[PDB]
Motif scaffolding. Structure first.
Motif, PDB file in Angstrom:
ATOM      1  N   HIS A 143       0.821  -1.212   0.000  1.00 54.05           N
ATOM      2  CA  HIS A 143       0.000   0.000   0.000  1.00 54.05           C
ATOM      3  C   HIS A 143       0.857   1.266   0.000  1.00 54.05           C
ATOM      4  N   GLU A 144       1.810   1.328   0.927  1.00 53.56           N
ATOM      5  CA  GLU A 144       2.676   2.500   1.114  1.00 53.56           C
ATOM      6  C   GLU A 144       3.563   2.675  -0.115  1.00 53.56           C
ATOM      7  N   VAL A 145       2.985   3.210  -1.198  1.00 54.64           N
ATOM      8  CA  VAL A 145       3.565   2.927  -2.510  1.00 54.64           C
ATOM      9  C   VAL A 145       4.028   4.045  -3.456  1.00 54.64           C
ATOM     10  N   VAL A 146       3.207   5.064  -3.712  1.00 52.71           N
ATOM     11  CA  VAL A 146       3.680   6.233  -4.490  1.00 52.71           C
ATOM     12  C   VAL A 146       3.554   7.524  -3.677  1.00 52.71           C
ATOM     13  N   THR A 147       4.481   8.463  -3.873  1.00 52.80           N
ATOM     14  CA  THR A 147       4.478   9.699  -3.080  1.00 52.80           C
ATOM     15  C   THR A 147       3.125  10.435  -3.168  1.00 52.80           C
ATOM     16  N   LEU A 148       2.683  10.989  -2.042  1.00 53.63           N
ATOM     17  CA  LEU A 148       1.328  11.542  -1.898  1.00 53.63           C
ATOM     18  C   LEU A 148       0.763  12.275  -3.120  1.00 53.63           C
ATOM     19  N   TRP A 149       1.495  13.273  -3.607  1.00 49.62           N
ATOM     20  CA  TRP A 149       1.019  14.163  -4.674  1.00 49.62           C
ATOM     21  C   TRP A 149       0.696  13.451  -5.982  1.00 49.62           C
ATOM     22  N   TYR A 150       1.276  12.273  -6.171  1.00 45.05           N
ATOM     23  CA  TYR A 150       1.152  11.567  -7.436  1.00 45.05           C
ATOM     24  C   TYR A 150       0.375  10.269  -7.282  1.00 45.05           C
ATOM     25  N   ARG A 151      -0.210  10.097  -6.100  1.00 48.48           N
ATOM     26  CA  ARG A 151      -0.939   8.894  -5.738  1.00 48.48           C
ATOM     27  C   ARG A 151      -2.331   8.894  -6.337  1.00 48.48           C
ATOM     28  N   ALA A 152      -2.711   7.767  -6.933  1.00 55.66           N
ATOM     29  CA  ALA A 152      -4.040   7.578  -7.526  1.00 55.66           C
ATOM     30  C   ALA A 152      -5.100   7.358  -6.461  1.00 55.66           C
ATOM     31  N   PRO A 153      -6.348   7.757  -6.753  1.00 62.24           N
ATOM     32  CA  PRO A 153      -7.425   7.634  -5.779  1.00 62.24           C
ATOM     33  C   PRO A 153      -7.626   6.215  -5.240  1.00 62.24           C
ATOM     34  N   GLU A 154      -7.433   5.197  -6.079  1.00 63.31           N
ATOM     35  CA  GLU A 154      -7.613   3.806  -5.638  1.00 63.31           C
ATOM     36  C   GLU A 154      -6.582   3.362  -4.585  1.00 63.31           C
ATOM     37  N   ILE A 155      -5.431   4.029  -4.563  1.00 62.92           N
ATOM     38  CA  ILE A 155      -4.429   3.783  -3.536  1.00 62.92           C
ATOM     39  C   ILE A 155      -4.782   4.582  -2.292  1.00 62.92           C
ATOM     40  N   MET A 157       3.853  19.811 -16.186  1.00 63.62           N
ATOM     41  CA  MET A 157       4.693  20.379 -17.239  1.00 63.62           C
ATOM     42  C   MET A 157       4.104  21.667 -17.813  1.00 63.62           C
ATOM     43  N   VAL A 158       2.779  21.771 -17.828  1.00 62.98           N
ATOM     44  CA  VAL A 158       2.094  22.933 -18.407  1.00 62.98           C
ATOM     45  C   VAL A 158       2.145  24.138 -17.476  1.00 62.98           C
ATOM     46  N   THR A 159       1.728  23.921 -16.232  1.00 64.40           N
ATOM     47  CA  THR A 159       1.586  24.990 -15.246  1.00 64.40           C
ATOM     48  C   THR A 159       2.873  25.211 -14.461  1.00 64.40           C
ATOM     49  N   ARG A 160       3.749  24.209 -14.471  1.00 69.89           N
ATOM     50  CA  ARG A 160       5.025  24.237 -13.733  1.00 69.89           C
ATOM     51  C   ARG A 160       4.805  24.333 -12.224  1.00 69.89           C
ATOM     52  N   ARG A 161       3.725  23.702 -11.772  1.00 71.72           N
ATOM     53  CA  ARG A 161       3.498  23.434 -10.357  1.00 71.72           C
ATOM     54  C   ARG A 161       2.597  22.209 -10.203  1.00 71.72           C
ATOM     55  N   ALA A 162       2.837  21.443  -9.142  1.00 70.00           N
ATOM     56  CA  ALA A 162       2.085  20.230  -8.844  1.00 70.00           C
ATOM     57  C   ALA A 162       0.585  20.459  -8.960  1.00 70.00           C
ATOM     58  N   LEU A 163      -0.110  19.469  -9.516  1.00 67.23           N
ATOM     59  CA  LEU A 163      -1.546  19.551  -9.758  1.00 67.23           C
ATOM     60  C   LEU A 163      -2.331  19.380  -8.462  1.00 67.23           C
ATOM     61  N   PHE A 164      -1.991  18.344  -7.697  1.00 63.07           N
ATOM     62  CA  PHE A 164      -2.600  18.103  -6.391  1.00 63.07           C
ATOM     63  C   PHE A 164      -1.530  18.059  -5.286  1.00 63.07           C
ATOM     64  N   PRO A 165      -1.075  19.237  -4.828  1.00 66.59           N
ATOM     65  CA  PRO A 165      -0.079  19.252  -3.763  1.00 66.59           C
ATOM     66  C   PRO A 165      -0.697  19.102  -2.371  1.00 66.59           C
ATOM     67  N   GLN A 184      -5.385  15.406   0.131  1.00 66.88           N
ATOM     68  CA  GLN A 184      -5.118  14.880  -1.194  1.00 66.88           C
ATOM     69  C   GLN A 184      -6.432  14.510  -1.867  1.00 66.88           C
ATOM     70  N   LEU A 185      -7.275  13.777  -1.142  1.00 68.86           N
ATOM     71  CA  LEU A 185      -8.574  13.358  -1.650  1.00 68.86           C
ATOM     72  C   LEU A 185      -9.440  14.533  -2.051  1.00 68.86           C
ATOM     73  N   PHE A 186      -9.517  15.534  -1.178  1.00 70.94           N
ATOM     74  CA  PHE A 186     -10.385  16.685  -1.405  1.00 70.94           C
ATOM     75  C   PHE A 186      -9.948  17.465  -2.632  1.00 70.94           C
ATOM     76  N   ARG A 187      -8.640  17.641  -2.783  1.00 73.68           N
ATOM     77  CA  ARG A 187      -8.076  18.330  -3.939  1.00 73.68           C
ATOM     78  C   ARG A 187      -8.465  17.645  -5.245  1.00 73.68           C
ATOM     79  N   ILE A 188      -8.496  16.317  -5.214  1.00 79.64           N
ATOM     80  CA  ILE A 188      -8.900  15.527  -6.366  1.00 79.64           C
ATOM     81  C   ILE A 188     -10.395  15.725  -6.660  1.00 79.64           C
ATOM     82  N   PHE A 189     -11.216  15.749  -5.607  1.00 81.48           N
ATOM     83  CA  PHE A 189     -12.668  15.928  -5.741  1.00 81.48           C
ATOM     84  C   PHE A 189     -13.066  17.305  -6.266  1.00 81.48           C
TER      85      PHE A 189
END
Ligand SMILES: CC[C@H](CO)Nc1nc(NCc2ccccc2)n2ncc(C(C)C)c2n1
Lengths: 264, 268
Positions: B162-174, B197-205, B212-217
């Motif tokens: 489970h403890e698998v990809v760094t928070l900001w890049y983690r998929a909702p299913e994880i 790459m477009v905005t030059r800042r993390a999408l869900f920091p 993390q969840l709320f930012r995705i929602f």
């Protein structure tokens, strides 16, 4: 769904089919080991199954360790009193590769009844890595079976467990099973398990997938049928003990089919 | 053993071990050495090393970092890698004000998908795609690096770590702890990276798992300067449902990449 990896299963199957040929140990390696025999190996592989049960490891882990052992012994002369050390190192290596929670090293020293020291296990580990040149991602009977299970219509838990059980039994007997590829052993195992429980055959869908027909699978079926029939009398018994449990639906308690039927 | 190699500078620290820029005194080749200490009285060769090495020996692709050699000692393990001049993270930071030209972005995504598709084609999840693990050269290539957290999956998948990809890049299913997860988790990541790459800042920091969840929602419901094509692919890379989510293989056939080239990156 995505868990069955639809965009990649064909690509993946081809690669496993390609790799099992490159990870195959040499057929007659036991003829060239002056101190160890097939019988001795059987003791070892059976003991690994016991280890697998005690520490509740994945079957995939067992299949890998056996591959590691055969490959190692395909290139290194090992004395009788060191066979288990190899085997222990293999299990550790396989655990580390495959397990979410591999047992710590101390636990591998424990099950070898303190015949070997922690340092010896650690040194053998590195030795195994060198001999195998770190190539540990070997295709296994299990990796093929688990793909074949996707062709059940519908799924049968007795079959899957029985398929697992037969394929597992093959790991014990280097004669004959060293001369069949994991994919073939899995294929025979799957047919034999399906035929026993439900009563039907190696599916047509899996013929276009594998390119294997019963006529190509014949020699393997016969050998596996033998082993199945003889299983209660075998010297090694841990696999039958393992597969009596509700976990595996008790498929080892089932009666093997008297014949298979196939010739003019 | 390492007599031939000459350390130049410290590159940093990946999921395991320590990385150095080094030069082969004999050939002149600039390499990166991943140094791994063992660990002999305990606990052995770390499973991260075993996995990265076993897998990276198999995987040979222009968009996957090349493992050149494995050098043993009794106490030290040295992985010899091809050197790449920098990582996507430093490149994006370097490009905070200027922007990254779109045809470059297209190229990098195209390549990242090609590399990732090759991973998925060979039963390998990367599970740690962040811009820090994506390496670029001056020729115009981008490569997947650090397979320390990688895993060789089976078909069908089973429960993995489970403890698998760094928070900001983690998929909702994880994030929501679904018992099974698959190739989709890598796609999600490249999705977040595309946007980055477009905005030059993390999408869900996110600051936490909940956050993390709320930012995705917020975003996807419960990236302005990008064309109609780009957005379509993005939202297909960021579908909530892992079954619905695009595969890397299908992503390469998107209209977005119809006019793709391979530009040389502005900046050194
Ligand atoms: C994979 C993450 C790794 C850990 O710091 N960073 C990194 N950075 C660069 N190069 C970009 C860089 C980063 C900092 C300083 C100089 C160059 N390279 N080049 C080859 C390698 C192999 C070990 C994969 C590597 N790993």
């Amino acid at each position: 769904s995505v868990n069955e990896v639809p965009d990649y299963h064909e690509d993946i199957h081809t690669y496993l089919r390609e790799m099992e040929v490159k990870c195959k140990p040499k057929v007659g390696y036991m003829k060239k080991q002056p101190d160890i025999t097939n019988s001795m190996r059987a003791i070892l592989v059976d003991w690994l199954v016991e280890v697998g049960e005690e520490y509740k490891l994945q079957n995939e882990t067992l299949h890998l360790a056996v591959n590691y052992i055969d490959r190692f012994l395909s290139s290194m002369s090992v004395l009788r009193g060191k066979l288990q050390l190899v085997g222990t190192a293999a299990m550790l290596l396989a655990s580390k590769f495959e397990e979410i929670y591999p047992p710590e090293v101390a636990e591998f020293v424990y099950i070898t009844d303190d015949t070997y020291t922690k340092k010896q296990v650690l040194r053998m580990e590195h030795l195994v890595l060198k001999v195998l040149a770190f190539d540990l991602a070997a295709p296994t009977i299990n990796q093929f079976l688990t793909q074949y299970f996707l062709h059940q219509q519908p799924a049968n838990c007795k079959v899957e467990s029985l398929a697992m059980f037969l394929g597992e039994l093959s790991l014990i007997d280097a004669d004959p099973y060293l001369k069949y590829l994991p994919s073939v052993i899995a294929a025979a195992a799957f047919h034999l398990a399906l035929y026993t429980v439900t009563g039907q055959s190696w599916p047509e869908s899996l013929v276009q997938k594998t390119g294997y027909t019963l006529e190509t699978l014949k020699p393997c079926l016969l050998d596996l049928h033998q082993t199945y029939l003889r299983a209660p009398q075998h010297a090694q018994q841990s696999i039958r003990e393992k597969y009596k449990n509700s976990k595996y639906h008790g498929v080892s308690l089932l009666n093997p089919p008297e014949t298979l039927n196939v010739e003019h | 053993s390492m007599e031939n190699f000459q350390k130049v500078e410290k590159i940093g620290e990946g999921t395991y071990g320590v990385v150095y820029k080094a030069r082969n005194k004999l050939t002149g080749e600039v390499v990166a050495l991943k140094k791994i200490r063992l660990d002999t009285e305990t606990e052995g060769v770390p499973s991260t090393a075993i996995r990265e090495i076993s897998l990276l020996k198999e995987l040979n692709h222009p968009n996957i970092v090349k493992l050149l050699d494995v050098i043993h000692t009794e106490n030290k393990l040295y992985l010899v890698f091809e050197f790449l001049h920098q990582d996507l993270k430093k490149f994006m930071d370097a490009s905070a004000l200027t922007g990254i030209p779109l045809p470059l972005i297209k190229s990098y995504l195209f390549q990242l998908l090609q590399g990732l598709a090759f991973c998925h084609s060979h039963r390998v999840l990367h599970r740690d795609l962040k811009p820090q693990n994506l390496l670029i050269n001056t020729e115009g290539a981008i490569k997947l690096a650090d397979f320390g957290l990688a895993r060789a999956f089976g078909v069908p998948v089973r429960t993995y770590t489970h403890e698998v990809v760094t928070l900001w890049y983690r998929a909702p299913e994880i994030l929501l702890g679904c018992k099974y997860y698959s190739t989709a988790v890598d796609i999600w990541s490249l999705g977040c990276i595309f946007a980055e790459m477009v905005t030059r800042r993390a999408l869900f920091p996110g600051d936490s798992e909940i956050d993390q969840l709320f930012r995705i929602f917020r975003t996807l419901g419960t990236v302005p300067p990008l064309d109609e094509d780009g957005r379509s692919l993005l939202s297909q890379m960021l579908h909530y449902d892992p079954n619905k989510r695009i595969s890397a293989k299908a992503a390469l056939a998107h209209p977005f990449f119809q006019d793709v080239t391979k530009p040389v990156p502005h900046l050194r």
